[PDB]
Amino acid sequence: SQFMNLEGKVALVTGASRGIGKAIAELLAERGAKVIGTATSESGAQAISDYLGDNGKGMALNVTNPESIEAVLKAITDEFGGVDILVNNAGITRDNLLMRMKEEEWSDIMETNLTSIFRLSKAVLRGMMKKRQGRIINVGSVVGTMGNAGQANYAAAKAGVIGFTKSMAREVASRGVTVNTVAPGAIETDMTKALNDEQRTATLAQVPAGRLGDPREIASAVAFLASPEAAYITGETLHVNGGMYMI
Amino acid sequence: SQFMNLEGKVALVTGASRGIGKAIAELLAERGAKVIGTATSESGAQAISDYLGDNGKGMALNVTNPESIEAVLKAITDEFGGVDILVNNAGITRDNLLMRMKEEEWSDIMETNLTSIFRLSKAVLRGMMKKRQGRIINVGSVVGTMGNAGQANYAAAKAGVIGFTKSMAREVASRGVTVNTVAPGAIETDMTKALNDEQRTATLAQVPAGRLGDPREIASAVAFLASPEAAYITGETLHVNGGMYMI
Amino acid sequence: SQFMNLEGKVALVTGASRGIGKAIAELLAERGAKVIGTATSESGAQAISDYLGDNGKGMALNVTNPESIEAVLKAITDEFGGVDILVNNAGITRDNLLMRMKEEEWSDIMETNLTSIFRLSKAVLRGMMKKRQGRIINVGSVVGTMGNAGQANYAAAKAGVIGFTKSMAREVASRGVTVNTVAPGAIETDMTKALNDEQRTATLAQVPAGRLGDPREIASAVAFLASPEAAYITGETLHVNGGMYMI
Amino acid sequence: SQFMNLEGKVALVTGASRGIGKAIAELLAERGAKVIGTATSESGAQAISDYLGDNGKGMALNVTNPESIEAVLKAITDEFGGVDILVNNAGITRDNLLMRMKEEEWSDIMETNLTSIFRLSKAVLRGMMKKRQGRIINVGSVVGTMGNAGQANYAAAKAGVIGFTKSMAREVASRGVTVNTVAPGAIETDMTKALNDEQRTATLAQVPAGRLGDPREIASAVAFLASPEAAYITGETLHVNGGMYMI
């Protein structure tokens, strides 16, 4: 149908090897987007090419390196046309209580989780603004809004992405580009599977819904914001957290 | 497809004669819901029956009267089965600066815009909680979050609906019911069409997107939250306002 | 000193017999305000007169009855001059899960916790707007922002007060009146003292600060917003909750 | 009096040469704090020493340099005792629409406005946590919450400080340290005085209060949060913006 139909759109999904990023890339492809998913390695890129088949391809991308960004965007533009949907999903953690947090743990998080968003967003915006049509969707975290002990760095970067997102939204709204954040709660991934039974129970205790989210549930929220139907949503943070926090 | 598919769901949409409510009811039917839309009069009810055809029907409902609520729900349950999706869209305005605002203008807004949501929500929840599956979606307003001079009553009631929504979300999350609000900005309707040129220009000036929203844009957000795919979204307020306010 | 000095201001504090309301009234008097505190009974009114001594007096007030409001304001205006600071602290709870919540438990909360604020605010505003100087301060609750199972009514009314506050703030800002809410978390009062050990431990577990708040802590926040120094704070909700929720 | 009395507290106020920072340092001294204000130059440090007289002193501090931080904190601890109140007020702007924003304009803002807060906060926290008593107060901006076109970098850093603040609040709440942000709106400073008449009118048009804030109004909000009376406020953002934004 014509409902939430992404046929004709080119989507770049960073960090698409697994979990949330993979669910996003698959669902955008299922709704008809041409999808380029990225990984930090060539092997990862191949795994992405494998799951996307004819609906797109995987590319190696170093989100902290300007030259890589330019090379990947050039390859995309040449084959598929300019990027219509950017999903910034790449991100890491470097957890530690503040008194134990190293300078490098702080600066790696800023680089990978916040500065990357500045760089990639800037790199795709010009084309979107010329077409007067675009979507930038940041995959954030409930931690950016709630805060979390032991994650002051991750929380800082995720909250920073929201301030960036609002400002960019204001800059580009009149030219038909929307900029939003999807903020997952506790989602079932490799990270949550690596927890103790006691830590899993503690996580679930914070969730009124009484379960972890599925990566598909994050993908659905992203696909929604990516759609023509979400044109009047901008500068928004869509929380998908099972009631863990309510704004 | 199986994406955002409401086949098998019974949806009650209050205030569905026109504009936003009508767009909601049509889209839910398009996605396969059986839809009961309401109006305050029988002729309105018939207009709704006319546009829904085989996908549902219209009923007369006084959202401030307990007996009417019980009669409408009984008729729905008997023919279609219990309500799976409640969209609380019925709502009025009674604008005035506070020094000019009559007791009755305050109380009518409370009754129609806030207490109605308590009554209807309570009336459908028991069945939802037994099935361990349900959606309650309130159509709010940016005015609930931003405030607006001359609409202290409307703002109070819409903000009140958010407090209710968050509490109810916490009560019923573990039993598979979600409760959320969609908060429209300035949407093109009969009300906005009744404005003079200067007032329309003033409204547009508050919108980064540089246009009014379409009722279909509110409907899309409602359909999204109504879907199986939005199961992990609860106690949330989804803003659809073209950047008029950014939370 | 001239810092946070309320000499020359007339303050009406509703619900001032004990706990938070009493702490507010005492502190405003300490900072030099002339304070009228209210209770629902004459004996309560006398208790207030007793603790205020020469710094003010107690009056019986039914915050749900127009005639009582007019009588109390007339008596205040005649003796002290018009109200400069209104603190809306009067408020009740009628807790129940929604399926158990009676019509009257809903409506009593609306009446006492939300509609009262409309009535009193409206009744003092005209004088404030003529002087181009005023403070309206609502004592809310963290429950208005967070929601709470079993308190959907109380949450609705407190959230409603915030929507009202923001709209009124916008109406009256240019005429030198501020309108704000102080939102207490779990504060040590008779209510919290009536809890068993297990319920107190459960409350404390939700508070990063690891203790209940003191009523004096709410009073200090109210005194701050009441001061000349807070003239540029309006439409704000000041959370005093030990980290129980972070906006 | 004993109300909002900072006697016995050592306060470090970064960026205290003028405007907001100067008003903060003066008011903390007026409430009895021993105040160390910082500037980036020795001459600035002397200007601060001059205005603080016997109530404190000025020190040169490079907030982007670890060695300087350690030297300044050692000098403070040796003479005054460990820092009880940190106010992070130092900050710059590097404005540009995203398509014009240089890598260095992005990275200078991150360094000076966000990473500095990580470094200085970390450097004073240990002592505060041992005493089980402390205040960290970040001077943010309405731009961090609202976003602003042409300031995506500044907005990112200020919003980031809020995510950091919430996380740190959660880490240290049980040890009697509070962490908060004061978020000024449009305040009268050298920056606002450098604007066109047309830009000043445009700024005022966004402010319901109809005027710019005074730096003293920001100082008062900071002094409040710094006080013993604000012990139950943590992880909060106190907006002081004349109604320019309402959360």
Side-chain angles (χ1 to χ4, degrees), chain B residues 71-103 105-129:
Chain B
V72 167
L73 287 177
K74 187 207 199 323
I76 292 163
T77 295
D78 289 343
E79 177 171 1
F80 300 105
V83 174
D84 300 300
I85 300 162
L86 173 66
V87 185
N88 289 309
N89 174 67
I92 57 177
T93 61
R94 295 279 187 274
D95 300 341
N96 258 327
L97 298 164
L98 193 66
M99 282 324 300
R100 291 220 173 76
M101 187 179 287
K102 301 169 165 193
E103 288 277 349
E105 293 169 333
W106 176 262
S107 64
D108 286 359
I109 293 295
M110 289 314 107
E111 262 289 334
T112 306
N113 301 5
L114 176 44
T115 297
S116 61
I117 291 195
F118 158 72
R119 298 215 177 89
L120 273 143
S121 297
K122 179 180 175 192
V124 303
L125 186 54
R126 177 155 272 157
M128 292 179 175
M129 280 195 298

Side-chain angles (χ1 to χ4, degrees), chain B residues 145-147 244-247, chain D residues 145-147 244-247:
Chain B
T145 295
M146 169 169 98
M244 178 184 281
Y245 221 59
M246 294 180 184
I247 293 310
Chain D
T145 297
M146 168 168 201
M244 179 183 278
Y245 219 59
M246 295 181 184
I247 291 302

Side-chain angles (χ1 to χ4, degrees), chain A residues 148-190 192-196 199-215 217-231:
Chain A
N148 194 37
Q151 299 195 293
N153 52 358
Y154 182 75
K158 296 296 188 181
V161 167
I162 292 166
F164 181 77
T165 292
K166 299 171 174 167
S167 297
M168 198 177 162
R170 293 186 184 280
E171 268 177 45
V172 304
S174 72
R175 287 185 292 272
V177 174
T178 70
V179 191
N180 294 295
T181 295
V182 175
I187 303 305
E188 184 77 273
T189 60
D190 289 340
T192 57
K193 280 160 180 164
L195 305 173
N196 284 26
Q199 293 162 322
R200 189 146 353 82
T201 303
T203 308
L204 290 180
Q206 298 190 66
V207 187
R211 62 168 181 92
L212 298 180
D214 188 290
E217 293 171 314
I218 302 315
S220 295
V222 168
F224 168 64
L225 293 173
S227 79
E229 285 88 343

